[PDB]
């Protein structure tokens, strides 16, 4: 009985962990997207002038 | 064992406690609750209570939810509230920020009955305008976190760690004692009941012949709960202006 | 000393709808102790060692 | 899953079908049923029906029992019947012999409403005098052996070979089909449902949005059964003079 309730708590923790992991992934990808976009928006004069 | 409180039985058992609704509103509820429950995608939706107003258009408040889960030692119900002033058309009762929660907590008196009204508060002189529906939501939240009564061990935890009805519930052994009841947000098997509340904030009257217990809140006078033990049903209702009773120490 | 012999015997014989009668009884007892049911002796045959026909 | 039909829910759901009781009789029942149930030692006692009379004092009939057992392939309920004419004081409704059962079956018309009256029959010219309560008990027996409706697989057999509520019953999968319901005296797992009855003697109306099915008997017009699927409750009631509809073939 004790083992089964421990296992249940463990599995619920696992599910919460997966939700947290996917949230982290989305945050990181959005951060990278914003970084790319800012880098691109910075080099626009150097593009329209030189290249 | 019931699966959801029945508004007919609630209004029948708690009518002696003065918790009544108009006849037109009773019929209108009988039609409107299923419509809103379906078109909101909710598994449960019931009449939570009725708050009196100064212009005679009392607010009926309904509460619904889909599933309850155990988080951080609490049985959290992702509840959603709706209000109405005729019993036929339900509108949303949107949550309120934490900063505004304090301000609406400072507003007292019977509500106006005009959802477009807004009260004024003054601070260091910065004036805030608080909409009436904010005050209504805050009063409902306070009353809900205070009472939310169910019988003890009527819920249970399942494999997915969700709080579900205990369909093998046999009933409260001693229905006239506060140990037989608990808050909704207490996990099953946690041993926390209404007897752990501040002593003197609950009253229990038990008719041992018919088997009907009535639990009244004295901290929020107007919250009534009933438990019928021969048919294993139960349910609660709030009726009143929504203000807490702060003079309780002088009234006991 | 017969206790260990009987234990090996029970963990040996397989259930009709499973295996290790010992472990079947152990799961039954764990389920009964998880939620002490109304009329546990009667619930042994109607809820744990079987399944009612319209359960789900 | 309910454990016993609730008279409040029955009167609420079957009121559209005209199965109603007086207000005074409703209150009187709310008091009188528990008293008689306790002082008779019965586990279950409910309102079975109401038979109209010529003098305005309709007979209320209540049915109770203690335990149901499987005998000879039938789920036998050792039932006991009581009658009343005000809803406050219940008297016994004693069984009738088999020989008298035929004679009272020959007596037709609306009952008189005077429990001391007795009708007369003539045979080969030997005259019999049949008491009115005999006629009442046999009409009740006929209607009971004809309908006695419960949902399918709502009962179950236990170790002592007794018929007990199936507390893990999940509900009827298709509530608008006659396969979802059965007679009370059919053993669990026997596969005999209302669809095995004479085709055309039952009508089913199912409100798929609210989840309330109504099963009406056409052979005994006046017997109504309701099944609410979102709350998992059900219950039946007879209201009428108690005579069978023999012209059914011409009316369908």
Question: Are D234 and D160 contacting, i.e. CB atoms less than 8 angstroms apart?
Answer: no
Query: In chain A, what residues touch B70 (CB-CB under 8 Å)?
Result: 12
Neighbouring subunits of D (3+ Cβ pairs under 8 A)? B, C
Cα torsion C44, B3, B14, D34: sign? negative
A48: contact with C, CB 8 A cutoff: no
Query: In chain C, what residues touch A4 (CB-CB under 8 Å)?
Result: 30, 34
What are the structure tokens assigned to D50, written together? 């109401």
Question: Are D183 and B182 contacting, i.e. CB atoms less than 8 angstroms apart?
Answer: no
3 state DSSP class of A5:
helix
Question: From C44, which residue of chain D is nearest by alpha-carbon distance?
Answer: D159
Select the residue from B167, B168, B189 to test the C interface by mutation, using most C Cβ atoms within 10 A: B168
Query: In chain D, what residues touch B38 (CB-CB under 8 Å)?
Result: 209
Q: Give residues with Cβ within 8 angstroms of C42, minimum separation 6.
A: D158, D159, D164
Select the residue from C31, C32, C33, C38 to test the B interface by mutation, using most B Cβ atoms within 10 A: C38
**DSSP assignment, residue D190?**
S
Cα dihedral D28→D33→D36→D37 (10° resolution): -170
Q: Give residues with Cβ within 8 angstroms of B184, minimum separation 6.
A: B75, B77, B148, B149, B150
> Residue D99 and residue B215: Cα distance in Å, rounded?
56
**DSSP assignment, residue B186?**
B
> Residue D204 and residue D216: Cα distance in Å, rounded?
6
Neighbouring subunits of B (3+ Cβ pairs under 8 A)? A, C, D
Q: Give residues with Cβ within 8 angstroms of B166, minimum separation 6.
A: B1, B153, B154, B155, B156, B188, C35
**Angle at the Cα of D44 from the Cα atoms of D90 and D77, rounded to 5 degrees:** 105
3 state DSSP class of B110:
coil
| R_g of chain B computed on alpha carbons | 18
> Residue B150 and residue D124: Cα distance in Å, rounded?
69
> Residue B186 and residue B16: Cα distance in Å, rounded?
29
- Are C35 and B166 an interchain contact pair (Cβ–Cβ within 8 Å)? yes
> Residue C49 and residue C53: Cα distance in Å, rounded?
13
> Residue D69 and residue D162: Cα distance in Å, rounded?
4
Question: From A16, which residue of chain B is nearest by alpha-carbon distance?
Answer: B71
In chain D, how long is the greatest CA-to-CA distance? 61
Question: For residue B50, which of B78, B10, B4, B106 has the smallest C-alpha distance?
Answer: B10
Q: Give residues with Cβ within 8 angstroms of D157, minimum separation 6.
A: D70, D163, D164, D187, D188, D189
Question: From A7, which residue of chain B is nearest by alpha-carbon distance?
Answer: B159
What are the structure tokens assigned to D206, written together? 């199912």
Question: Are C10 and C3 contacting, i.e. CB atoms less than 8 angstroms apart?
Answer: no
3 state DSSP class of A23:
helix
The whole-angstrom distance between B194's CA and the closest CA on chain A is 26
Select the residue from D231, D234, D235 to test the B interface by mutation, using most B Cβ atoms within 10 A: D231
What are the structure tokens assigned to B210, written together? 């018919």
> Residue D168 and residue D158: Cα distance in Å, rounded?
13
Strand order in the sheet with B223-228: B91-92, B80-84, B59-65, B44-51, B233-239, B223-228, B212-217, B202-207
Q: Give residues with Cβ within 8 angstroms of D2, minimum separation 6.
A: B2, B231, D232, D233, D234
B70: contact with A, CB 8 A cutoff: yes
Query: In chain A, what residues touch C34 (CB-CB under 8 Å)?
Result: 1, 4
The beta strand positions in chain D, using DSSP E, are 44-51, 59-65, 68-71, 74-77, 80-84, 91-92, 118-123, 126-131, 149-151, 155-157, 162-165, 181-183, 202-207, 212-217, 223-228, 233-239
Question: Are B202 and B215 contacting, i.e. CB atoms less than 8 angstroms apart?
Answer: yes
> Which of D8, D34, D209 shows the shortest C-beta gap to B9?
D8
Query: Looking at chain A from residue 11 to 40, which residues have their Cβ under 8 Å from any Cβ of chain B?
Result: 11-12, 15
**Residue/partner pairs of C41-49 with CB below 8 Å, 24 or more apart:** C42/D158, C42/D159, C42/D164, C43/B168, C44/D159, C45/D158, C45/D159, C46/D156, C46/D158, C46/D159, C46/D164, C46/D166, C47/B168, C47/D167, C47/D168
| Entry field: residues in chain D | 252
- Are A8 and B70 an interchain contact pair (Cβ–Cβ within 8 Å)? no
Bridge pairing between strands D44-51 and D233-239: parallel
Question: For residue B3, which of D73, A37, D169, D120 has the smallest C-alpha distance?
Answer: D169
The whole-angstrom distance between C24's CA and the closest CA on chain B is 19
Between the alpha carbon of residue D18 and those of residues B130, D11, D15, D51, D252, the distances in Å are 51, 10, 5, 13, 21
> Residue B92 and residue B62: Cα distance in Å, rounded?
10
B169: contact with C, CB 8 A cutoff: yes
The whole-angstrom distance between C13's CA and the closest CA on chain B is 29
Question: For residue B48, which of B244, B206, B240 has the smallest C-alpha distance?
Answer: B240
In this structure, what are the phi and psi dihedrals at residue B5, rounded to the nearest 5 degrees? Answer: -60, 145
3 state DSSP class of D80:
strand
Q: Buried b / exposed e across A19-37, counting CB within 10 Å, b at 16+?
A: eeeeeeeeeeeeeeeeeee
| Entry field: residues in chain A | 51
Beta bridge partners of D120: D129
In this structure, what are the phi and psi dihedrals at residue B15, rounded to the nearest 5 degrees? Answer: -75, -30
The whole-angstrom distance between B10's CA and the closest CA on chain C is 26
C34: contact with A, CB 8 A cutoff: yes
Question: For residue B77, which of B14, B163, B12 has the smallest C-alpha distance?
Answer: B163
Helix (H) or strand (E) holding B171: none
What are the structure tokens assigned to B179, written together? 């140990």
Between the alpha carbon of residue D228 and those of residues B58, B233, D19, the distances in Å are 30, 16, 17
**Environment class of B87 (CB within 10 Å of its CB; exposed 0-12, middle 13-18, buried 19+):** buried
Question: From A3, which residue of chain C is nearest by alpha-carbon distance?
Answer: C30
């Amino acid at each position: 009985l004790a083992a089964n309730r421990s296992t249940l708590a463990d599995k619920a923790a696992s599910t919460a962990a997966t939700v947290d992991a996917w949230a982290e992934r989305q945050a990181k990808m959005e951060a990278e997207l914003q970084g790319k976009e800012l880098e691109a928006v910075r080099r626009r004069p150097t593009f329209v002038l030189r290249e | 064992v019931q699966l959801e409180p029945n508004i007919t039985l609630v209004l029948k058992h708690l009518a002696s406690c003065g918790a009544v609704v108009s006849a037109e509103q009773q019929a209108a509820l009988d039609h409107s609750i299923p419509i809103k429950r379906i078109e909101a995608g909710l598994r449960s939706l019931t009449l939570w209570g009725r708050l009196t107003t100064l212009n005679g258009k009392d607010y009926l408040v309904a509460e619904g939810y889909n599933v309850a889960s155990s988080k951080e030692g609490a049985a959290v119900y992702e509840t959603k509230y709706f209000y109405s002033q005729d019993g036929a058309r339900w509108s949303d009762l949107q949550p309120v920020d934490s900063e505004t929660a304090t301000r609406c907590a400072r507003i007292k008196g019977m509500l106006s009955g005009d959802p477009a009204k807004n009260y004024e508060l003054e601070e260091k002189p910065l004036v805030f305008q608080i909409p009436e529906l904010a005050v209504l939501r805050c009063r409902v939240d306070a009353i809900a976190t205070a009472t939310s009564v169910i019988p003890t061990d009527s819920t249970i935890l399942n494999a997915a760690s969700q709080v579900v009805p205990n369909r093998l519930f046999a009933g409260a052994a001693y229905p006239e004692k506060l140990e037989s009841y608990q808050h909704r947000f207490s996990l099953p098997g946690s041993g926390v009941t209404l007897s752990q509340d501040l002593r003197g904030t609950w009253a229990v009257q038990y008719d041992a012949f018919k088997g009907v217990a009535q639990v009244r809140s004295l901290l929020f006078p107007g919250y009534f709960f009933y438990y019928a033990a021969n048919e294993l049903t139960w349910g609660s209702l709030y009726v009143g202006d929504g203000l807490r009773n702060n003079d309780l120490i002088f009234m006991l | 000393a017969d206790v260990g012999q009987a234990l090996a015997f029970l963990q040996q014989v397989k259930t009709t709808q499973g295996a290790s009668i010992y472990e079947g009884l152990k799961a039954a007892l764990a389920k009964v102790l998880e939620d002490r049911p109304v009329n546990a002796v009667e619930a042994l045959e109607t809820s744990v060692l079987s399944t009612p026909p319209a359960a789900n």
